[PDB]
Amino acid sequence: EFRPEMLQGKKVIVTGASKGIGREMAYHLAKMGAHVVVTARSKETLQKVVSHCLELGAASAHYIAGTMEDMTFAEQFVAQAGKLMGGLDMLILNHITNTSLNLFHDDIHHVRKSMEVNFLSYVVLTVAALPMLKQSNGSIVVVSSLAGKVAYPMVAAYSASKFALDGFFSSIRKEYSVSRVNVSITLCVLGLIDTETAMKAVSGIVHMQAAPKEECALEIIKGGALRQEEVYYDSSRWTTLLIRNPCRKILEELYSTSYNMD
Amino acid sequence: SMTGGQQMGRGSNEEFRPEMLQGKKVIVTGASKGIGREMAYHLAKMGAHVVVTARSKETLQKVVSHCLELGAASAHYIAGTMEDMTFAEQFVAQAGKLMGGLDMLILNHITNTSLNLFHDDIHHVRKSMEVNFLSYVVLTVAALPMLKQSNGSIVVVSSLAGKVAYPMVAAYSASKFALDGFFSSIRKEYSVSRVNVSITLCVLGLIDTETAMKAVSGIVHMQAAPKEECALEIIKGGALRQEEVYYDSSRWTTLLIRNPCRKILEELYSTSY
Numbered sequence: 001e002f003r004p005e006m007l008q009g010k011k012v013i014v015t016g017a018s019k020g021i022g023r024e025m026a027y028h029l030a031k032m033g034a035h036v037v038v039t040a041r042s043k044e045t046l047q048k049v050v051s052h053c054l055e056l057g058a059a060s061a062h063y064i065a066g067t068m069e070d071m072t073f074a075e076q077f078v079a080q081a082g083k084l085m086g087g088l089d090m091l092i093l094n095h096i097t098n099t100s101l102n103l104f105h106d107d108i109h110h111v112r113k114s115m116e117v118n119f120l121s122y123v124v125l126t127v128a129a130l131p132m133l134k135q136s137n138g139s140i141v142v143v144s145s146l147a148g149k150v151a152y153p154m155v156a157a158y159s160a161s162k163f164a165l166d167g168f169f170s171s172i173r174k175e176y177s178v179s180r181v182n183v184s185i186t187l188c189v190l191g192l193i194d195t196e197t198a199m200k201a202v203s204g205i206v207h208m209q210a211a212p213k214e215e216c217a218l219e220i221i222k223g224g225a226l227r228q229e230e231v232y233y234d235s236s237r238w239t240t241l242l243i244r245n246p247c248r249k250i251l252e253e254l255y256s257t258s259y260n261m262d
Numbered sequence: 263s264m265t266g267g268q269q270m271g272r273g274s275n276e277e278f279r280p281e282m283l284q285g286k287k288v289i290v291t292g293a294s295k296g297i298g299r300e301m302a303y304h305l306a307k308m309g310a311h312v313v314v315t316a317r318s319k320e321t322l323q324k325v326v327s328h329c330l331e332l333g334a335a336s337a338h339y340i341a342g343t344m345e346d347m348t349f350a351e352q353f354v355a356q357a358g359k360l361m362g363g364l365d366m367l368i369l370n371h372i373t374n375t376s377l378n379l380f381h382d383d384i385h386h387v388r389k390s391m392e393v394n395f396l397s398y399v400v401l402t403v404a405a406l407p408m409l410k411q412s413n414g415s416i417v418v419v420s421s422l423a424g425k426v427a428y429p430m431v432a433a434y435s436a437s438k439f440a441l442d443g444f445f446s447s448i449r450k451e452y453s454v455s456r457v458n459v460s461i462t463l464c465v466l467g468l469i470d471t472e473t474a475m476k477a478v479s480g481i482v483h484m485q486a487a488p489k490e491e492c493a494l495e496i497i498k499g500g501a502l503r504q505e506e507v508y509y510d511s512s513r514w515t516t517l518l519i520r521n522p523c524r525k526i527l528e529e530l531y532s533t534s535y
């Protein structure tokens with residue numbers, strides 16, 4: 001059972017926190033009395049988020065602007081954020097590259113950009129954050145989607161990057177379990193969220209219910225705080241019930257008696 | 263010449279026959295050894311036209327020779343690295359010119375990988391995504407016009423590590439999961455765009471290839487399935503236009519791998535766009 005006091009005094013990074021779900025997470029964390037470091041490209045929008053974080057009761061609030069297309073910026077950002085807060089308890093990996101609903105034809109550029117921003121930068125940010133996370137027995141929160149678990153048309157590049165997140169983070173979670181690394185990994189599988197970007201992208205074409213961004217952001221924080229392996233948040237109760245793969249968890253437990261690492 | 267007809271009649275979506283590959287124009291990547299080499303050998307026996315690729319000219323030459331001996335209608339190789347996106351794009355054009363078209367594209371190559379705990383090896387994370395996933399995308403883009411012409415097939419070789427989580431294969435698993443997300447999404451696109459190009463995702467367990475046996479030695483203790491039958495099962499699925507192929511030593515694995523809930527969610531969401 002979650003309690004907002006679990007985040008009181010915690011040192012948290014939130015990526016893509018200038019708008020949408022990311023901004024909402026920063027706001028909830030601020031209300032909880034956490035130390036926050038927010039990032040995105042827009043200095044001006046980040047400044048506004050930092051100001052209202054302080055107004056909500058954040059123990060401290062800072063921003064560092066830059067693009068996650070740059071792996072050097074991603075690595076340096078974590079070092080600077082950790083130096084500002086004097087450590088790190090939670091790393092929330094939320095940013096994605098701008099994407100839309102379009103058929104795939106020959107845009108290898110958009111496939112590469114999505115893999116770099118949505119997946120490779122999460123790996124670099126994890127590598128940079130891990131020593132501090134090992135010190136605090138902290139958590140890694142990875143924001144994904146239904147399109148990161150099941151197939152949908154018009155999101156091929158986006159889906160590839162979200163699936164990669166699962167393959168990578170679920171594999172290191174198994175490694176941490178056998179290596180006795182007390183760092184939790186929360187994969188967040190989300191449905192349609194009423195953010196300005198998502199509403200604009202699904203206008204007309206798609207006909208489905210959007211869930212509120214405020215509660216979504218809170219559910220993500222809850223899972224990370226409770227050290228839940230996975231979080232599921234969608235409008236439909238049919239979706240939430242079918243998204244779980246119990247056979248996958250059984251296969252993994254059956255195969256855990258095949259390797260040696262001692 | 264003074265003949266015509268169709269191999270694909272009643273039952274041809276369920277029961278395989280080697281004659282379905284007779285005269286077919288097939289590309290096999292990473293075909294100098296392992297499963298890839300075995301696929302080239304089966305296709306040769308079936309009387310298909312084959313174009314093999316891998317980096318080693320010398321090993322590819324040997325594979326080409328054995329294919330011709332087995333009864334391949336034609337057999338050629340083009341050597342190069344799949345780290346090079348220019349080579350990947352040009353390879354398909356050259357292979358298509360050598361065969362006069364393309365019926366099946368078998369995406370099988372991977373970068374050299376081992377069983378090791380994640381250790382911030384960023385170069386291995388990147389090279390894995392590039393060779394194992396991004397080159398498959400470039401090869402697909404290059405091949406698609408000819409596949410559209412022949413109502414052809416794309417065969418994507420993946421792993422159990424491309425469906426479920428295992429330790430010591432983080433970057434490899436990321437690259438194999440990405441293939442699923444990408445190829446399963448475009449399969450849905452082809453269905454609504456009326457693109458008659460099938461996509462077969464192959465989910466393989468441990469296979470007795472020299473590479474895999476060497477890599478698992480003293481780290482992984484599990485039953486290895488024969489490479490010969492594995493290569494045949496992959497060909498079967500592509501020929502039958504099966505969405506997915508599963509091949510593993512354990513019968514418990516073959517029963518648990520399928521995700522019926524995933525197929526239900528997709529069918530439920532198909533009435534939203």
Ligand SMILES: NC(=O)c1ccc[n+]([C@@H]2O[C@H](COP(=O)([O-])OP(=O)(O)OC[C@H]3O[C@@H](n4cnc5c(N)ncnc54)[C@H](OP(=O)(O)O)[C@@H]3O)[C@@H](O)[C@H]2O)c1
Nearest residue numbers: 016018019020021040041042067068145190193195197198
């Ligand atoms: N909303 C939904 O329907 C939905 C559904 C499923 C999953 N999700 C997941 O939720 C997360 C957030 O989505 P959202 O809908 O809240 O998005 P959003 O409102 O568009 O915001 C994305 C954030 O990422 C930042 N960003 C974009 N490009 C960047 C770059 N190159 N470098 C660094 N930051 C960059 C943006 O700020 P700047 O432009 O100023 O850089 C922005 O703050 C994503 O991981 C998404 O996959 C959302």
Ligand SMILES: NC(=O)c1ccc[n+]([C@@H]2O[C@H](COP(=O)([O-])OP(=O)(O)OC[C@H]3O[C@@H](n4cnc5c(N)ncnc54)[C@H](OP(=O)(O)O)[C@@H]3O)[C@@H](O)[C@H]2O)c1
Nearest residue numbers: 292294295296297316317318343344466468469471473474
């Ligand atoms: N064996 C198993 O247990 C197993 C299990 C599940 C799935 N699989 C999948 O099966 C497929 C084949 O595996 P395998 O065990 O048969 O592997 P393998 O014998 O080691 O073959 C890999 C092939 O790819 C080539 N290759 C490597 N790097 C390359 C590059 N940069 N550019 C182009 N070609 C390159 C290799 O030849 P060169 O070095 O001469 O280039 C070789 O022909 C892969 O997709 C693998 O993921 C295998």
Ligand SMILES: COC1CN(C(=O)C[C@]2(c3ccc(F)cc3)[C@H]3C[C@@H]4C[C@H](C3)C[C@H]2C4)C1
Nearest residue numbers: 099100101145146147152155191192198201
């Ligand atoms: C900007 O995209 C934001 C919106 N995001 C999603 O993940 C939501 C979905 C999507 C994906 C990309 C789009 F462009 C538009 C919609 C994705 C999961 C669900 C099924 C479909 C695929 C449609 C919705 C809801 C990231």
Ligand SMILES: COC1CN(C(=O)C[C@]2(c3ccc(F)cc3)[C@H]3C[C@@H]4C[C@H](C3)C[C@H]2C4)C1
Nearest residue numbers: 375376377421422423428431467468474477
């Ligand atoms: C290059 O080796 C080839 C072998 N390959 C596999 O995919 C097989 C596995 C693996 C993965 C990478 C390795 F290096 C070693 C083993 C993978 C699927 C199964 C469970 C485990 C993960 C162990 C085996 C069997 C690529």
